[PDB]
């Protein structure tokens, strides 16, 4: 949130991938990555990350 | 557009003003110069090296040198005037004329019109015809130069006499016909062609403030044609000449300066001048000529430099040869190498002998008064380079004066210009100069800061606060007092036992007419401060050996615009930077008020004037408090205590409340 | 004093030309600059319109020229002798002034001396107040404009206003054996006049859009004449009006065109320039940060190898060697032409003619979709159970028609439609946070031509939450086709945030049933 | 240093208040003029209908 | 609007937060096609001036 | 030469804040500070970066060698920010609280990661590509310039620190190597040679240093803003490019300082930096003015005047073979007077007079001179000049006594060099047991009490009556900057006890004693109660300063949010011409601005007090470390840093006392 407030998507994405390196399959982190990719409007990666969320949750209303 | 390459020639000793000349000789001409030791010499510069001719014996300091001829013959006789006599050489080492012209002090200018000889002095002017006195004049002010119009293209000889007090007295016989007025004290003047002007006669003058002109002296009145009054080109004109260097077909004006600046003025407008090429030289030019001296076939300018470096500015390129990889540089390098080796040997052995067995010089100083400001501009010059200059009291590359100011001069600089700003009062300044010579001596100079630039006319319709001195004077002594008290007045008491001078304050225009006879003196004025200072200083000199009730109003109305401008300066520079912080964002398209938008552009000039503002504000406050104290002192009161209230009022500066506090208490 | 021309008419000594514009297009003299000394060598007076570009040859005596004067017509310079054929010489000292300029000859133009010129219009009648001449620059702006209608003395005609021409070069240094004169006007009419028969051979109007500089440097050596359309295309419409090749390949309109008889260096407005060849191939483009105003390229030593002087649109200049960058600094506010300034037979001196007045010289296969197993299973279900789907969808459609008719009738009852013979349309917009909102009703009569006289608006609100000053007001006569914004100031009174609906009813004054209605959910107060 | 930014803010605030009062007074004058114009046009329609 | 915190003012397109065309997918602003799953953190574009945001 | 490119940038460039960096990886660009706290980037268009805070440092380099991009660094008096401009993302945004007065970027000795060194109040720091503190040491005074140069030739570069104390120290990864005492606050250092570095001051002096000596030096006006060593003539050896306060860019030589290339501008010179704009594979030299113009470059008769001067000297000697007997000798004498200055008396064993004396010393007198003036009624043979140096550093006066008669217009100038010793003040006296300072340090020395006595005679102004026996002895000295006391006690056991109540004096004495006996290691037993109690007071106050600043910042954030809301509300009320509510919003805004300005005043005041406290703490750690020579120095420094990061104040004082 802090990094997105300072308009720094590519810092937030690196931080999210660091977190996923810590927590290997977290759903909120993958969903945040997908939200950032959709705000930047490149859906071809937001669909991939929502599909990862699905592979983890499969009931996720957002993805 | 014009380019002149700086090719150096022989170096002679230190030279005075207009001490270089060119013998007319289609090939290369010959250069003739005169050192301050009397060694007049001439060379031709055949190929790189100076083939010296008749380098004579040392004598007195050559004050002037001029070449002329009796008839219409090509003028070749070179006349000098060293101490008190005029010697004359042919175009070789045969002296033919030696006119003793027994005088008192020295010669400062001279002109040779065939047989006619017009020489100057400190104050005296003489016109001889072959060692026979025929005209004698004694001006009231020192003479700077004398010229006579062409006695051939015209019929009568009308010698012009340039005085120190900004006048050109165009006299005939032994009495002035009329006097032309010129801005600034004239220093050089020469008819502006090889004949003296196509349309009859024309006189071209150049003044010490830096100004050129073309006074056309008719039989009874002058006809001013143009003036080259400058702004950035300050510096006393020491030499001027006419020669066609640009090659357009009409002769150009080659003018020198006192700060090295050499300038060419073309007349491409067919009637008026325009600058074409300027070049600085790091010393003071003393003589300029045209023609060619090296590699005939290319017109060049010969410039005599104060220390003696007879330099030339040629129109021919210098890079003659270029390939895959000049040699004259190597030749000059080797010559200087060998000379410096052998001279080091000799001077080291002599230093050893001198130290085991254990130098006068010249400083061309100029203590002038800038008129556009209120600051004297002292200018020291030495032939060698300076090491340090003391300034004790009672463009410059030199270091800090913080200490009694000591100035060190970096690297190899000859001249040093420094400003000096003194208040309307506080009369009473030494300067020790040390050159970079081996014994490292020091020479002291004593200038005076007098207790007002002198002009020729005043306005009597101003409120005059007259003042009268009476009783037991020798007119010479009263004149000595006025010389002690005023900047620009001749020392010698003017003849007639009755003299009147028309001064003018430069900080703000207030006249100080001063009239005096053998035993009486009237010092009218437009300022209370001026007459108060005069009263005090004249009473001091004596011990050694009326009011217009509206004058204060006039002086305050004079001051008001300056204080208003200073306060507006401060008020705008307070907000300059705050507005600049807003400027860097949103590009200033729609929001900034027009009021501050008027400041956003001129921010630079405002900021650079704010640097000088505080000195002007302090000076104005001091002048106002002195005016107040003095105008209450004349009535017999002592109001040295009410000053702080006046200071507070000026911090407020209600001009009407200011005049109210002036009239009431 | 703004200028138009800049041209180096060389080989005399360094003779540079400058065409200034006076009071009404006058050249007092078409001044010679003499760029390294700024004096007048040979003055060129007697020209009533702003010329732009001279013309030279190898056999010319270097003093006569070709002044394409933007104004009435063209005046080719032949040592103070403008001699064209039949319509182009038009009295080169202003003919539409000096028929009436004789009354304004006592001093300069100022409104003090104009009010004593009451007899001067009628003490001398050179013309009976002809409409072509009586009002050119200097006269009374109010009192003599009532005598134009009652006089109405007739006029003449001539060739239209020009910018550039095209002329011959081979038989030039006699100025009478010329054959083709193809000049470019403003109405994109390059008229081809011939003095061998006093005729009009052709006229080039195929762009029918105005050129900026018509001829890429007055001609090309291959005669591929380069007209520049003000649309975004540059043509290769040849000399003597041959068949067009047209390269539209520009992202925007072209600004400024010179040529070095090898390339076409045009400007652009998409922050670039384009170097086209004679055929239309882009040889090299150059990127610049801002838009361009005027370019040029200097003389050719090799095949066009020197520097380019390219100004910008924010007072900047930008100099280049096509590949390597040199300068960005801020001299000219605008500029006319950049040419030589060469004096003393040096390499190159550059000139720059700004629009403040100065003369500056400063040197520094398709996407067909794919269907998954879901689609084939769905189609199999449809093929095996199509009848039930059809029947149930028809039943659902019947029920949907029923419910839609029900809701439509209920809306007609309550008259809640903001769109409803009797044509109207109203919708209410709310603006503003804070306790005071601006509520503007956009109302509109939607009919061919029929106004609605008697209507009135009544608001329905909760008098404990909103304080409407005028909850009922007449509406102006609604003219068919205009949206009337009728606004009011709603104000929230509840100290706690309470959002309540507000109804609006538009109704006749003789009826009691609302003609139509609207609803607005008032937002939260954000009070204090 | 505030660089006298507060002084510029005070000046601008005074300007804004002055302009707001001016707009209020102009609104009141405009309303009076509108009422008087309504009376005048009432009379004019009457005199045209007669 | 009244709060500026992003360092870069005009950063490269692709590194800042400030598919189907509007002929298929409905839109909300000049771009920004309608999304699924409205969350209270959605900004979905930003206004340019206070006036535009109010009006 | 000729400027290979020129351009005009509309933004005022802050002087010492300029850098060139390939922020696109392969596309070099210019980063430069500006007014309002914004940093602009020139790509070959100008792009702004809102630091929103007054910048004080700026550089650009490679901070993580894994990628090939330059990282734009931006320092502020309370922050430090690395920035990847290409993919805009903070490499690290660290909060220093010591300030950013001078930063560099390179590899120190025995550190495998390019550090972003920084210099604040009195303490340096170091950060890797993520922002981890890897280097930290304390220095004398405010650091003004830093550069990386391999003094000592061992392949790992030590860092050169220019303290506001007029000193230039060289720091290894942990150890201090050497310190040369310049004469004014340093402003810029630049290395490009092996062990040679070019330095600038605020006098205007630009000079060059070998290991521990100056090749050349030139002092002028218009003190240098930015120095940078480049190879203009391409002779293979770098030269000192310099940009002065007037505009002059003079490329000099690293040999005797002879001007080789020269250029001029319209305003002052902000920065001279090398970087290959035009993509030619070879470095360039860009000069950037203060007013925002950039220009980029790619890489005769005076001796006859000297001949003429030699001939003039020969003329003088031949004239010989305002006059003065040739055997006139100027003899000086130093002394010290209480009833408070070091007097220097100059005389002449003749009837001649001393008309004026112009002493020239670098850092003692204000300015470079102190011309003594005697009025014409006061002239005599012997004249005394009072001197009051500001600090204890040995200075060398170059006296120039103007010798001549009474009524003379020209007279000689005798030159004479006299060195005021390090401790020129403190006219030492008899002991007073009542006023002996309770502070004390003890340490060990090798041998040779007589060698220490020679040390005393070399670094102190003992009178001629003195004599010291090999027995243990105490020497007392009254300070002359203040009325303090100093007591040196040499014990028979070879121990030394310095009993001065000033800690800097003890550090100076112990370090001079070490450097005099060629000692590489020393450990002290120290105790300064009066100083330690005050240090504890400051350490106590720091925490409450932190808390008050936190609370004030919270409140001001609240009020700023209120003010932005009111701005929006006022714009709304004005868009519907509702003037009562608009005027009420404007009144509330006025009141909030008044309250926030009061809050700003009080915060700033507390913040400056906090900076004073932090500098006190850092300078105290440095004063503790500076008291010990060699390997104990950085040991004590890191020990105190760890004892303060853990708030173990008692351990801090324990390690400062004996450890």
mmCIF file of N, CA, C and O in Angstrom, chain C residues 316 325-330 431-433 435-436 438 489 526, chain F residues 4-8 10 278 568-569 572 575-576 578 581 585:
data_model
loop_
_atom_site.group_PDB
_atom_site.id
_atom_site.type_symbol
_atom_site.label_atom_id
_atom_site.label_comp_id
_atom_site.label_asym_id
_atom_site.label_seq_id
_atom_site.Cartn_x
_atom_site.Cartn_y
_atom_site.Cartn_z
ATOM 1 N N UNK C 316 13.979 28.748 -29.123
ATOM 2 C CA UNK C 316 15.273 28.080 -29.168
ATOM 3 C C UNK C 316 15.754 27.884 -30.603
ATOM 4 O O UNK C 316 14.955 27.731 -31.529
ATOM 5 N N UNK C 325 24.963 16.496 -32.504
ATOM 6 C CA UNK C 325 24.265 17.654 -31.957
ATOM 7 C C UNK C 325 25.252 18.731 -31.530
ATOM 8 O O UNK C 325 26.346 18.430 -31.044
ATOM 9 N N UNK C 326 24.865 19.991 -31.731
ATOM 10 C CA UNK C 326 25.731 21.127 -31.441
ATOM 11 C C UNK C 326 25.149 22.096 -30.422
ATOM 12 O O UNK C 326 25.797 22.375 -29.406
ATOM 13 N N UNK C 327 23.949 22.628 -30.655
ATOM 14 C CA UNK C 327 23.495 23.805 -29.925
ATOM 15 C C UNK C 327 22.024 23.710 -29.550
ATOM 16 O O UNK C 327 21.210 23.210 -30.328
ATOM 17 N N UNK C 328 21.703 24.168 -28.337
ATOM 18 C CA UNK C 328 20.355 24.567 -27.930
ATOM 19 C C UNK C 328 20.428 25.811 -27.047
ATOM 20 O O UNK C 328 20.759 25.724 -25.859
ATOM 21 N N UNK C 329 20.106 26.977 -27.609
ATOM 22 C CA UNK C 329 20.098 28.235 -26.866
ATOM 23 C C UNK C 329 19.000 29.107 -27.475
ATOM 24 O O UNK C 329 18.461 28.800 -28.538
ATOM 25 N N UNK C 330 18.656 30.203 -26.798
ATOM 26 C CA UNK C 330 17.363 30.865 -26.963
ATOM 27 C C UNK C 330 17.516 32.273 -27.535
ATOM 28 O O UNK C 330 17.419 33.255 -26.799
ATOM 29 N N UNK C 431 -24.431 18.819 -7.742
ATOM 30 C CA UNK C 431 -23.013 19.139 -7.724
ATOM 31 C C UNK C 431 -22.630 19.683 -6.358
ATOM 32 O O UNK C 431 -23.380 20.450 -5.749
ATOM 33 N N UNK C 432 -21.459 19.274 -5.880
ATOM 34 C CA UNK C 432 -20.894 19.867 -4.690
ATOM 35 C C UNK C 432 -21.010 19.009 -3.453
ATOM 36 O O UNK C 432 -22.046 18.390 -3.210
ATOM 37 N N UNK C 433 -19.936 18.948 -2.680
ATOM 38 C CA UNK C 433 -19.986 18.404 -1.332
ATOM 39 C C UNK C 433 -20.414 19.524 -0.384
ATOM 40 O O UNK C 433 -20.874 20.586 -0.811
ATOM 41 N N UNK C 435 -22.473 21.292 3.066
ATOM 42 C CA UNK C 435 -23.902 21.405 3.393
ATOM 43 C C UNK C 435 -24.749 22.005 2.286
ATOM 44 O O UNK C 435 -25.971 21.830 2.310
ATOM 45 N N UNK C 436 -24.154 22.692 1.314
ATOM 46 C CA UNK C 436 -24.901 23.349 0.245
ATOM 47 C C UNK C 436 -24.557 22.699 -1.087
ATOM 48 O O UNK C 436 -23.396 22.707 -1.505
ATOM 49 N N UNK C 438 -25.564 22.345 -5.309
ATOM 50 C CA UNK C 438 -26.184 23.007 -6.446
ATOM 51 C C UNK C 438 -26.938 21.958 -7.246
ATOM 52 O O UNK C 438 -26.335 21.010 -7.756
ATOM 53 N N UNK C 489 -30.477 25.812 -4.939
ATOM 54 C CA UNK C 489 -29.474 25.563 -3.908
ATOM 55 C C UNK C 489 -30.114 24.738 -2.800
ATOM 56 O O UNK C 489 -30.852 25.272 -1.965
ATOM 57 N N UNK C 526 -21.269 16.097 4.805
ATOM 58 C CA UNK C 526 -19.916 16.537 5.152
ATOM 59 C C UNK C 526 -19.962 17.912 5.816
ATOM 60 O O UNK C 526 -19.220 18.833 5.468
ATOM 61 N N UNK F 4 32.260 21.479 -27.910
ATOM 62 C CA UNK F 4 31.712 20.520 -28.860
ATOM 63 C C UNK F 4 30.193 20.505 -28.833
ATOM 64 O O UNK F 4 29.563 20.147 -29.832
ATOM 65 N N UNK F 5 29.580 20.897 -27.717
ATOM 66 C CA UNK F 5 28.139 21.108 -27.724
ATOM 67 C C UNK F 5 27.786 22.180 -26.704
ATOM 68 O O UNK F 5 28.521 22.417 -25.749
ATOM 69 N N UNK F 6 26.656 22.848 -26.932
ATOM 70 C CA UNK F 6 26.140 23.838 -25.996
ATOM 71 C C UNK F 6 24.628 23.698 -25.899
ATOM 72 O O UNK F 6 23.972 23.246 -26.842
ATOM 73 N N UNK F 7 24.080 24.097 -24.753
ATOM 74 C CA UNK F 7 22.635 24.116 -24.572
ATOM 75 C C UNK F 7 22.298 24.984 -23.369
ATOM 76 O O UNK F 7 23.142 25.234 -22.506
ATOM 77 N N UNK F 8 21.051 25.449 -23.328
ATOM 78 C CA UNK F 8 20.567 26.324 -22.268
ATOM 79 C C UNK F 8 19.413 25.646 -21.549
ATOM 80 O O UNK F 8 18.374 25.364 -22.160
ATOM 81 N N UNK F 10 16.637 25.981 -18.539
ATOM 82 C CA UNK F 10 15.940 27.090 -17.896
ATOM 83 C C UNK F 10 15.959 27.026 -16.376
ATOM 84 O O UNK F 10 15.389 27.918 -15.739
ATOM 85 N N UNK F 278 27.688 12.454 -26.356
ATOM 86 C CA UNK F 278 27.535 12.238 -27.788
ATOM 87 C C UNK F 278 27.745 10.802 -28.207
ATOM 88 O O UNK F 278 27.713 10.549 -29.420
ATOM 89 N N UNK F 568 -10.196 22.330 -1.068
ATOM 90 C CA UNK F 568 -11.185 21.718 -1.957
ATOM 91 C C UNK F 568 -12.573 22.297 -1.692
ATOM 92 O O UNK F 568 -13.312 22.643 -2.621
ATOM 93 N N UNK F 569 -12.942 22.417 -0.414
ATOM 94 C CA UNK F 569 -14.263 22.925 -0.064
ATOM 95 C C UNK F 569 -14.448 24.367 -0.521
ATOM 96 O O UNK F 569 -15.535 24.751 -0.964
ATOM 97 N N UNK F 572 -15.054 24.456 -4.157
ATOM 98 C CA UNK F 572 -16.431 24.051 -4.419
ATOM 99 C C UNK F 572 -17.389 25.208 -4.177
ATOM 100 O O UNK F 572 -18.222 25.528 -5.032
ATOM 101 N N UNK F 575 -17.173 27.673 -6.908
ATOM 102 C CA UNK F 575 -17.719 27.253 -8.194
ATOM 103 C C UNK F 575 -19.230 27.422 -8.274
ATOM 104 O O UNK F 575 -19.773 27.491 -9.379
ATOM 105 N N UNK F 576 -19.923 27.475 -7.137
ATOM 106 C CA UNK F 576 -21.352 27.743 -7.108
ATOM 107 C C UNK F 576 -21.660 29.156 -6.629
ATOM 108 O O UNK F 576 -22.801 29.436 -6.246
ATOM 109 N N UNK F 578 -21.227 30.747 -3.946
ATOM 110 C CA UNK F 578 -21.765 30.843 -2.592
ATOM 111 C C UNK F 578 -20.691 31.515 -1.747
ATOM 112 O O UNK F 578 -19.758 30.861 -1.274
ATOM 113 N N UNK F 581 -20.144 30.903 2.490
ATOM 114 C CA UNK F 581 -19.414 29.692 2.842
ATOM 115 C C UNK F 581 -17.983 29.740 2.325
ATOM 116 O O UNK F 581 -17.066 29.252 2.990
ATOM 117 N N UNK F 585 -14.683 29.388 4.629
ATOM 118 C CA UNK F 585 -13.575 28.432 4.372
ATOM 119 C C UNK F 585 -12.263 29.215 4.395
ATOM 120 O O UNK F 585 -11.325 28.760 5.072
#
